[PDB]
Amino acid sequence: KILTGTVVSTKMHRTIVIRRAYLHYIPKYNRYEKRHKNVPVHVSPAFRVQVGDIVTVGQCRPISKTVRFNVVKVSAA
């Protein structure tokens, strides 16, 4: 696919931790529900920047024990 998020954990030579940030609704009203799952970056080459900032990344092939999405281009800076 292709998604986004704000890079969470810098340190891990070739594997940014970037946080993507859902927001779900429900019945009872639905305004307050500020969910957020975190996923891993990548991984086989280099060239990039640090914590904060938002990069693209897009489903690599099962690149390492659950780290399945390499980083395309850095959208945020």
Binding site: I26, K28, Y29, Y32, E33
Partner: protein, 116 residues
């Protein structure tokens, strides 16, 4: 979002458990209770152990002329009279309440039906 509260709860594990339409079980003793305040009478009930849980309970042979069972051996089926977490009851602390038996009761019947 938020917030779950009290009232009726999940945890269960009572004394007939099966929310049974009864509970088979042998007739331990024939203990005719005794009425509560206001009203007053010798409330003929029966104590018995529940084949299932074994657990022992005592309940009114409630009929009207039928300590016919009253077979220390013989085995009624008991069965609560939803109070629910309570007893009726002129009849002091009796939980469930006599059912059918020796397995087969109108409780009076076969042949005819007598009464009560």
């Amino acid at each position: 979002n938020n917030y779950k509260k009290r009232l009726l709860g999940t945890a269960f594990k009572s004394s007939p458990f099966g929310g049974s339409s009864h509970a088979k079980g042998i007739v331990l003793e024939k203990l005719g209770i005794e009425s509560k305040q206001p009203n007053s009478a010798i409330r003929k009930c029966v104590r018995v152990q529940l084949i299932k849980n074994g657990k022992k309970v005592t309940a009114f042979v409630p009929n009207d002329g039928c300590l016919n069972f009253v077979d220390e051996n013989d085995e009624v089926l008991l069965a609560g009279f939803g109070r629910k977490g309570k007893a009726k009851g002129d009849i002091p602390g009796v939980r469930f309440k006599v059912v059918k038996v020796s397995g087969v009761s109108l409780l009076a019947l076969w042949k005819e039906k007598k009464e009560k």
